[PDB]
Amino acid sequence: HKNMYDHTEITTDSLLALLGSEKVKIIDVRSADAYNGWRMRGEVRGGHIKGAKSLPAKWLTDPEWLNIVRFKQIRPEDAIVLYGYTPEECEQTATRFKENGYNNVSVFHRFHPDWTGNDAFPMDRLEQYNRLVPAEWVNGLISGEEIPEYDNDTFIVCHAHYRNRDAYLSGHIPGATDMDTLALESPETWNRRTPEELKKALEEHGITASTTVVLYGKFMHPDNADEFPGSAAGHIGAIRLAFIMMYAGVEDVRVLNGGYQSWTDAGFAISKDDVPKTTVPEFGAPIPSRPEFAVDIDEAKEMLQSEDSDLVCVRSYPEYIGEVSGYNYIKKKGRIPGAIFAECGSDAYHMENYRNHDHTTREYHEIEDIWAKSGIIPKKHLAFYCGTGWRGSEAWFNALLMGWPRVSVYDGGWFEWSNDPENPYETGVP
C-alpha cells in the first residue's frame, strides 16, 4: 500500500544493518555545509552517516530536481532512506520521491542526537571542511558572535570580481570590501603577480598574513558574447584569489560556499555602500610562504615525465579536443600532451562538474570518485590547470578541502604553454 504522505520509519538497528548494502541509498537532506562537517545544531560530531549522499531539501524548488537525483544515480529500484536533523525535515522530500516513481522510501528519525551522539555509529566529513564556510558563519563573524572554527581577532570579508566593481556595488555582504582579481594576477601573463606586488596589494586592501580573509564572489550569468565573460564568474574569481592568497601566505583563508547566492538564500541583509579600504602597513610574513601551491612551466614539464606526478586539465571538452580555445583572447587551440582530463563543465566560465546548481561545491565523494577513475589520487603530486588558472584553482581548492597532501595549480596553463611555439600539443578527439 503506497502512501504519498505517511512515510515508514526505519529504526537505528535496521539502518545499521544496511550500511553496506549496494541496494540502499542513504540521503542527507540537510545543507551541504552540515553534510561536509559543520556542526550547525551544536552536535558534538558533525558530518554525515557513512556512505550517505547529499541532497539538500532546499533543492526541492529547483525545476531540475529529478534530474539531479538521476544524475546522482539514485534510482527507483533502490531502497531510499532519508534523514535530516529531524524527521519532519524529510517529509516533503520523501513525498517528492514517491511522486516520481520511487516506491521504497523510508525516513530515519534518529540521526540527531542519537547517531551523532554515539561514537560507535560511523560518520564521515570533508577533512578540511572548516575552510568552506556557510553563510551563517560569516554572519556570526561580522556580528561579533561566537562561532565555531574561529579563534582569531582580525578578519576581512572580500568580494572578488574581475574588472567589474558593479558586481560589488550592486549588492554585497555588509562591511565587505571589493578586490579586483587584477590586484593579485597580471594581465600580461595571467599568472599571480610578483611577491613585491602581492605584498603591496594585500596591504592596501587591509590584509595581513594573520588576518582571517573570507572570500566570495557573485555569479552573474557569464555570456561568451561579452568582451569579459569573467566579470560575471565572480565566485570562480573568489576561489582563484583564495589560491593566490594561500600561496602568498595568508594563514587563514575561507571561501563562502556557493558565494553571494548563499548569503541571499539565507535571507541576510545586503549592503550597497562603497566601503573604503582600511590599509595596513606590513603584511607580516615573507611572500610566498607556501610556494609549493604554485607550479610554473618547467616544473610542470618535469611532472609530465615523473611517475609520482601529473598535470590535471580542468578545461571544457570543446577546448580539450581543440574545437575552440575557450577564450576570446587565445587564438591557439589544442591541449597539453600527457595531462589527465578532468572536464570542468560547459565552457571556460562555468564549473558544472564541480558545483551544484546553487554554486556550492559538488558532493566531495562524487568528485573524489570521478577523479580516481582517471588516476587523479592523493598519493600523487598533482598540478591542476586550465586556460590561465581560474578553473584550475577551483579544482585545486576542492582537493585541498579533502586534505590531499600535494596539490598545486600549474599557473601558466594552456595560455602560457601555447604561447611558446616550440611546445608540443595535441588536437582532435583522442
Ligand SMILES: C[N+](C)(C)[C@@H](Cc1cnc[nH]1)C(=O)O
Ligand atoms: C584571467 N582572466 C580573468 C582574463 C580569465 C578568468 C577566467 C574565468 N574562467 C577562466 N578564466 C577570463 O576572464 O577569461
Ligand SMILES: [Cl-]
Ligand atoms: Cl562564478
Ligand SMILES: [Cl-]
Ligand atoms: Cl590542455
Ligand SMILES: [Mg+2]
Ligand atoms: Mg561520506
Ligand SMILES: [Mg+2]
Ligand atoms: Mg595563469
Ligand code: NA
Ligand atoms: Na606523469
